[PDB]
Amino acid sequence: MTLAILAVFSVALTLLGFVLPPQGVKRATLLGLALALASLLLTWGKPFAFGPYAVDGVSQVFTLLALLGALWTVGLVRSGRFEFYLLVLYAALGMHLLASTRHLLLMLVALEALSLPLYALATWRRGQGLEAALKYFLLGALAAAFFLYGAALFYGATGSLVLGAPGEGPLYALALGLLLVGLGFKAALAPFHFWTPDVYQGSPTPVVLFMATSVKAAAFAALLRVAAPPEALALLVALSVVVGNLAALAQKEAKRLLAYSSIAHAGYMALALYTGNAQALGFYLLTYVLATGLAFAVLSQISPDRVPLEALRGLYRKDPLLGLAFLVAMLSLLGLPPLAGFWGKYLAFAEAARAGAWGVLVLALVTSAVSAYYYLGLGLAVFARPEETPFRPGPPWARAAVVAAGVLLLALGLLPGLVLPALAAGG
């Protein structure tokens, strides 16, 4: 009954914001999201299903992550339009629904629910932001069509629109493919990745924080629900990691570089999909979400519109703690010890090798080493001599947020035997 909280706050604030100063609405939306997360903790080990709607360990972990991302992204945004909060609220529920069901059609409706309000969140209205928004909507609705014909073909090979239905030969194979298309696009796996560079660079940074954390989370959550075969998995991984890192090399811009990098990262997480461990994947995404949320909070404190790579430089001198935190984020996203990113990566790699897929694992790993070029090209870039750069040094809100996130990262780098004990049933 986190869903209850979500629907309630969204619907209520809709009309309330007519009577409230936009700030009052910000206070409100913030409050709501945090409360939903609270209900998530109080339900740990209490898994609950109602309709096609189902809350279990997975739903719990992945919406814990998603809710976290939504709170952080609302923290930064001070625009005096109450809707620029409202849309976030909507989107959040949408992602929760996406992670919370096996029903293909409810999954579809949930997809529209989460995806439509982000299209509107893509507008600072800076000339790029309309281009970004456009590409996003067109490619998005296309994928909508695909996941829908996929649900229709799943209902095709078998009596149900609910996943887990017994399944045929080639038609079933086809149907699982058509579900895999949309669900894959939403996660930025190659070669579905083309939007990712454009939209991250085009959309206002804090929004991108929201996307690059919450969306990827929810998407992998729904992905685990699908039955996907080893060969396809191999393909997606290979392409994601290769093109992701290689093209990320070519990147002169922080956001875009981060996009390609995130393509590679979706590539890494997709290995957990081999066994679908989800204690492992849950962990990986915990670490990743923390680090990335951090990274984009910092990219927000630089500029909302665009951040080049040099802008990151000299950040240590300016603010020591933010320099350090960004560094840590770069390392956790690199998957280097002793950071939680290493245990997430390791857990995915472990499930991968456990599944006995070797060449794939290897390639993923090799080009994962490729990623260190740009990961240090940022993390170390922190220490160079500061060039002329925009800097607005945050509220306590942001400083304490970013640092907290980093600390949570490295804490679980050393003691995953804290949370990992229950990313499972919740003991």
Partner 1 sequence: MSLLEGLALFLLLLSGVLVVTLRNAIHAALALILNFLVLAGVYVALDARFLGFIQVIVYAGAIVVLFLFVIMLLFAAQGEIGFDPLVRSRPLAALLALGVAGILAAGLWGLDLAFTQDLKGGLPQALGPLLYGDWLFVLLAVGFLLMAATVVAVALVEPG
Partner 2 sequence: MAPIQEYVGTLIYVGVALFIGVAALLVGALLGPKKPGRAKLMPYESGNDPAGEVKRFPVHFYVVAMLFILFDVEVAFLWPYAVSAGGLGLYGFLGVLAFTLLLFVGFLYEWWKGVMR
Partner 3 sequence: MSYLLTSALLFALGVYGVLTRRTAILVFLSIELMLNAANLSLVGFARAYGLDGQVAALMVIAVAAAEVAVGLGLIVAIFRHRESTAVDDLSELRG
Q: Which residues are at the interface with partner 1 (CB under 8 A)? A: 7, 10-11, 14, 50-53, 81, 83, 86-87, 90, 93-94, 97, 103, 105-106, 109-110, 112-113, 116-117, 119-120, 153, 156, 170-171, 173-175
CB of 365 to partner 2, least distance (A): 49
Which residues are registered as beta bridge partners of 53? 101
Q: Report the partner that residue 18 touches, choosing among partner 3, partner 1, partner 2, none (CB closer than 5 to 8 A by kind).
A: partner 2
User: Which phi-psi region, left, alpha or beta, contains residue 163 (left: φ > 0; alpha: ψ -120 to 50)?
Assistant: beta
CB-facing half-sphere around the CA of 181: CA atoms within 13 A? 19
The values of phi and psi at residue 284, to 5°, are -50, -50
3-state SS assignment for residue 203: coil
Nearer to partner 3, 141 or 224 (CB): 141
Amino acid at 222: A
Residue 309: count of CB within 10 angstroms of its CB: 17
Q: Could you give the 3-state DSSP secondary structure of residue 338?
A: coil
56 binds partner 3 (CB under 8 A): no
Quick check: 281 and 224 in contact, CB under 8 A? yes
Fill in the amino acid letter for 72: W
User: 220-279: which residues touch partner 3 (CB under 8 A)?
Assistant: 247, 250, 256
* Near partner 3 by CB under 8 A: residue from 22, 24, 47, 156: 156
* Strands (DSSP E) found in 240-380: none
**Taking the complex as a whole, how short is the minimal distance between the CB of residue 93 and partner 2, in angstroms?**
12
14 lies in the binding site for partner 2 (CB under 8 A): yes
Residue 11, interface with partner 2 (CB under 8 A)?
yes
**Contact call for residue 183 and partner 3 (CB under 8 A):** no
Contact 224, 278 (CB under 8 A): yes
Closest CB 299 distance from partner 3, rounded Å: 17
Residue 256: CB minimum distance to partner 1, A: 23
Work out whether 44 is an interface residue with partner 3 (CB under 8 A). no
CB 111, min distance to partner 3, A: 9
Torsion of CA 89, 90, 93, 99, to 10 degrees: -120
The reply to whether 148 sits near partner 3 by the rule CB under 8 A is yes
Q: How many CB atoms lie within 10 A of CB 37?
A: 20
The pair of three-digit structure tokens given for residue 102, joined into one six-digit string: 């096996």
Identity of residue 162: V
The residue ranges that bind partner 2 (CB under 8 A) are 11, 14-15, 18
The residue ranges that bind partner 3 (CB under 8 A) are 105, 108-109, 112, 116, 119-120, 123, 127-128, 130-135, 137-138, 141-142, 144-145, 148-149, 151-153, 155-156, 158-161, 197-198, 201-202, 247, 250, 256
